[PDB]
Structures are given as C-alpha cells and as structure tokens.
Design a protein around this ligand. Structure first.
Ligand SMILES: O=C(O)c1ccc[n+]([C@@H]2O[C@H](COP(=O)([O-])O)[C@@H](O)[C@H]2O)c1
Ligand SMILES: O=C(O)c1ccc[n+]([C@@H]2O[C@H](COP(=O)([O-])O)[C@@H](O)[C@H]2O)c1
Ligand SMILES: Cc1ccc(O)cc1C
Ligand SMILES: Cc1ccc(O)cc1C
Lengths: 346, 346
C-alpha cells in the first residue's frame, strides 16, 4: 500500500496549459463557460486521459456493507434492506441503475461486508458479515482496512485497463450515515450535533440518540485525525473504506472519480488525509441534503455542480453528473474557434 | 393574442396526484430523490405531456437580434458578432450547438431583428434591422411587440405538433444584457446598480456608464411595471420579446420550457406578468454568473439546478439541463417498487 500511495502521479501542468490556451480561443467570450472550462482543464491534467479532456467507458462502483451500529437504533430501515437492494442492483431496478443507464455507465456492485448470505452476481470482497458496532469499539482492525483499500484500489485501476476512464463512487448500507458523521466530526473538528443528519428519514425525535452514539464512538475509540486509516478502521465501515479505495485506485491510475453524497464526502476526507495527491482527481457531483454536507464540502474546498436536494446514496448523484463531464469534453473538442470566424475581442 | 392568453391550460392536479403516489412507492426512502421527484410531478401536470413525465423530441429556440443601445458603449463585442454567430449556429460550431447535440436536441435559429443582410438557413421573423436605442426612446412600438409574440407563440406550439415535448429558450445579441437589466430593475423594483452586470466581459471601468444608460432608459420611457408588454416594447429588445413568445407558446401548448441565463430570466419575468398561468410550465436550468441573477430568480421564486458560473447565453444552459429532465422521467418509469421487494418502511 505504501508503493500505491508513493506512485500516485502529479497532474500534468503542460497538458493543462495547452488545454487552457485552446479553450480561450473557442467561439465564445473568454471564461464565459465558467466551471465547464475549469473542469475541462482539470481533466486534461489527469495522466490517464492522455493529455486531453475525454471520456471513454464509464463505471459506477457501489460498495455495500452492513454496520453493527444499526443495533443502537440510529436507522429506521430494516437491516435486511442492504442485502435486498444489493440484489436489486443486479436487476437494474434501483435508482443508481436507472440513472447510470441514462448516462451510458455500467454499475459494478461490490459486497465488502453485507450481513447475509452471498448474493450471486455481486462482486465478492466481503471482509465480514457487517463491521463492529462503533459505539462500543472499533469497526475493524487496521490490517482489515489496509487490506480492503489495496484490494479495491487494484480492482479499480484494473478496470482502467479495460477502457474505463471515468469512475463514479457509491455505497449502500443501512445505518451508514452514523459512521460517516463520526468521520466528518473527527476530520473537520466539528461537534457531532453540527454534522449528524436524518439519514434515510430518521424521525426528528431520534436525532438526539444518533448524536449521542456518534460522540460515544469517538470517545471510546479515540481515532487519530492525522491518520486517515486509523479513523476509517475505528469509526468508519467497510463500505466507507471501499469508497476510499476507489479514490486511491483511480488516482494511482491517473483517472477522474466523481463523488456522490454525504457518505462519499466522508470517504474523500479520509482519502485526502491518507494521500493529499488524490485531491486533483476528485470531481464533485451534487450537494447532499444531509445536514453535515456543507461542513464536509468546505473542508474539501469543493463546490458541487448540482443542487438537487438528493439524499439517496447508491452513487445516484455521481451518475447524474456524468453528462456534465461529457459536456466539458464536447465543448473542448467540438466548438469552433474565434480566429476562424475573424472575431477579435479586447 | 387575447385568445392565446385566455386559453393557457391550468396544470392537471389529478395527474400530479397519481404521479406523486407512484413516486412514493419506488425503491427508495420517500422523498430521497428530492428535486428530481418534484420535477417529475411538475411535468406530469403539464397537459401536453399526456398525464405522465415523458420527453419526446427536444428543441432549443435561439432568438437573435441587434440593439440600438450598442451605440451607448455598453458592450465590448463588435456588433457584427450577432450576424456572424447566427450563421455559425447553422454550422453547429457554437456552444449551444455542441451542448444541444450532446442532449439530442435540435437547435432552431431565429432572426427576429439582426442588423445585417438575411442569413440563409436561419428562420426569418425579423421585425427590423436592430431595435431602437432604449437610451433615447422605445425599442419598438407596442404593435410590433404584440405581433412578434403571436408569431413566435404560433411557431412554438406548431413544433409541438411535430413531436417536440421539451423546449429550451436562448438568445444571441450584442448589448442585450443592458435591456435585460432595465427590465429586471422595472419588474423587481431594484436599483439599476444592483442588477447591472459585466455581460460579455465589459471592463469594470465601463460599468458606471452601463448603469447610467439603464437609468436613462427607464426615466425616458417610463415603462409600466404592471404591463409586461409595455416594458418589453419600451426597454426590451426583439430577442427578449421572442423568448417571451416561446414561453407563452409552450404554455398555451401545455408543454415545458427550460430557461437559460440572465436574459431568459428577464423574459420570464415579463411572461409571468403578462400571464401568471405561464409559471407552472417554466423549469430553471442554471444560475447565471451575471450580477442581477439572484434578484431576478428570487422574484420568479426559482432555484436553478446547475451552478456552473456560466454566462454565455445562446440557450447553452438550457441544453445542459435537458439530461436532468430526462433523468426525472427515467426515474419515474424505470425504477422498481418497494412493495415488489417486500420492503416496508415506517
Ligand atoms: O448519499 C447521501 O447523501 C445519503 C444521505 C442519507 C441517506 N443515504 C442512504 O441511506 C442509507 C443511510 O441512511 P441511514 O439512516 O440508514 O444511516 C444508505 O444506504 C445511504 O446510501 C444516503
Ligand atoms: O445568459 C447569460 O446569463 C449571459 C450573461 C452575459 C452575457 N451573455 C451573452 O453575451 C451577450 C450579451 O452581453 P453584452 O455585454 O453584449 O451585453 C449576448 O449575446 C448573450 O447571449 C449571456
Ligand atoms: C463574442 C461572443 C459573444 C456572445 C456569444 O454567444 C458568442 C461569441 C463568440
Ligand atoms: C430503504 C432504502 C434505503 C436506501 C436505498 O439506497 C434504497 C432503499 C429502498
């Protein structure tokens, strides 16, 4: 894993300069396509894209796992929903499936720790049947977190060898906004009350308990904010570790990764703590309706493109933003140039 | 035109209720797809869509015209750019062309008043070679504004008979953020300084003059805020009137219209003043980087989906949002249902 982190490439400033000059000469007032222009330049700097903003095959990786903290009464969805929904993912009837189909992306469903019998058709990388209840101890051992990061990182960059140039990250796991909140609190130094949300429709009256659980998790585990792996293993979950793995893998591969919602923000904070070099490869999608989204995004210095009040998870927001990445590429390659129309601007 | 306004249909509450019930039963926590859900219900209520959120053919109508106020030094782009860019529209090299192609939409370029010889391939509805300079008098006569509204409204609903179910509105015209600002000031009661922006890269040092011009336009013409046609004819432009026409026409046709940027907001304010019944058919796209966007959107009670710092115009933002409308339809029709998976939630 040390080799992985060490070999993440820096962005190509040469390709970015060439891209910027090309964009400035297109048929429009300079800077007028705003963040679409910035996104094109960002893509051009990613080594896996071969010096130009382009999109080949697209994949959304959905990390599925159960959480022991579900027993603390922090979620209203039956625990079995993780297993049921994971199977639905193989049938194409879920939210991320429908949105990925619209974007022409393939969904890869990965079981990194569902508490049920193995599901045929789902990629099997299960660490255990659900992680430990973070309210009374760690979610997993450091060894388990490291092993899963390496496994997922390898799977991710291996897809790159099959033509994938754009990744979207997602998750599925009942009770997972609890460890996500714990992680966000630890990494940002914000009090649990400011980052704990209603997750999947938790009744307002049960929020107090959820906040109490997050605080106990942190007090009991004492995760070190300066060690991303320590935080993930202590107050995270297998799904969260898996998402961090996709980000490290895509970065190693020099390719872009679209974030999703709140859960993905928590994983991104961990990934950036572990390897700051991962940051230039992350692209935000939407602004999650979860209470702690604003704080998490502020610490990542990210401004999402889409304001849809979405809070489904599954990688649904990442899939919805794929057309925006393709639009930036289309602008770059297909627009005419000012000079060719003899248009001169101040 | 009185008949047109009188016959705009009210939204179908029955279809909307059926849509809401269907969305609540899909495979996800209730309300979790947020504004995508609200958008689907909004679409279901539009009579031209036949009781369900669906998208058939898509068209972006780009209204092109020149403005006499260009002579007041309020724009840095050469006046001939309107004519040049309008021809580029027929070649598919412009920003809206490239983005519409990505969304599978056709672009219709309409000349409603370019100050140049007619351009082959562009739809000809020219009122005159540029409108009057609003700094010294009206842009056009009330008769001219009314005639153009009716003509464009008919053209728009006629496309509906050819399979178009989703419209996007756009414009092209040097100096047009000046009349747009004047209109926004009149309709919202905001001072010109709060709504006048840099348009297509106007140097910060020339802003003062642009603000002075807007104030003179309003003082000299005395447009009546309660009469949308009066405002359009006095301090508007042919392109702005044309955009208002697309909105009235789509509403009469019971079909959705996606707004674009600042210019489109000014036209929407006029359209809603003329006929409040038009409002349920308007769908925002992006949040224009123009200074007066926030005020204009607040008065329309609209929150755009996309935050791209875009300020190109041409209907580029409307085209970029078309995939979002298709996503809401895909969610509605393609997602599985909770009951079918035996999932019961509180
Ligand atoms: O992605 C988000 O921003 C998001 C926000 C709130 C809830 N969720 C989803 O709902 C689940 C977590 O909610 P909960 O209440 O069980 O902690 C999990 O399967 C997520 O995919 C997802
Ligand atoms: O759509 C917007 O929000 C927008 C904001 C600023 C400038 N524009 C475009 O630039 C032109 C107007 O800018 P200007 O400086 O000549 O008033 C016109 O052709 C518009 O399409 C468009
Ligand atoms: C200069 C300029 C202004 C507005 C446009 O839509 C396009 C161009 C090229
Ligand atoms: C209940 C529930 C929770 C999260 C999902 O992604 C989907 C469903 C159906």
């Amino acid at each position: 894993l040390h080799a992985l982190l060490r070999d993440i490439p820096a962005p190509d400033a040469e390709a970015m300069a060439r891209t910027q000059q090309h964009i400035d000469g297109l048929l429009k007032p300079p800077g007028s396509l705003g963040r679409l222009e910035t996104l094109a330049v960002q893509l051009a700097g990613m080594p896996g894209l071969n010096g130009t903003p382009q999109v080949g095959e697209k994949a959304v990786l959905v990390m599925c796992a159960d959480h022991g903290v579900w027993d603390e009464g922090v979620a209203v969805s039956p625990k079995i929903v993780t297993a049921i929904q994971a199977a639905n993912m193989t049938r194409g009837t879920t939210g991320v499936c429908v949105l990925a189909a619209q974007a022409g992306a393939k969904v890869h469903v990965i079981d990194v720790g569902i508490d049920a019998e193995p599901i045929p058709g789902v990629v099997n990388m299960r660490v255990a049947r659900g992680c430990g209840n973070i309210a009374v101890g760690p979610a997993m051992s450091r060894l388990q977190a490291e092993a899963l990061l390496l496994e997922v990182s390898r799977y991710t960059c291996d897809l790159a060898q099959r033509g994938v140039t754009l990744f979207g990250v997602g998750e599925l796991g009942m009770a997972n906004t609890t460890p996500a909140a714990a992680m966000v609190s630890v990494f940002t130094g914000s009090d649990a009350k400011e980052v704990v949300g209603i997750g999947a429709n938790l009744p307002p009256s049960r929020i107090d308990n959820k906040v109490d659980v997050v605080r106990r998790a942190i007090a009991i585990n004492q995760p070190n904010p300066r060690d991303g792996i320590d935080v993930l293993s202590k107050v995270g979950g297998f799904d969260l570790v898996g998402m961090t793995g996709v980000m490290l893998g895509a970065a190693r591969c020099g390719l872009p990764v679209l974030l999703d919602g709140f859960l993905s923000y928590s994983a991104a904070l961990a990934a950036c703590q572990i390897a700051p070099a991962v940051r230039p490869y992350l692209i935000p999608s939407h602004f999650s309706a979860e209470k702690g989204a604003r704080i998490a995004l502020a610490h990542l210095s990210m401004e999402p493109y889409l304001h849809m009040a979405m809070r489904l998870g599954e990688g649904s927001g990442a899939a919805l933003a794929m057309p925006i990445v393709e639009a930036a590429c289309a602008m770059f390659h297909n627009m005419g140039e000012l000079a060719a129309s003899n248009i001169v601007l101040p």
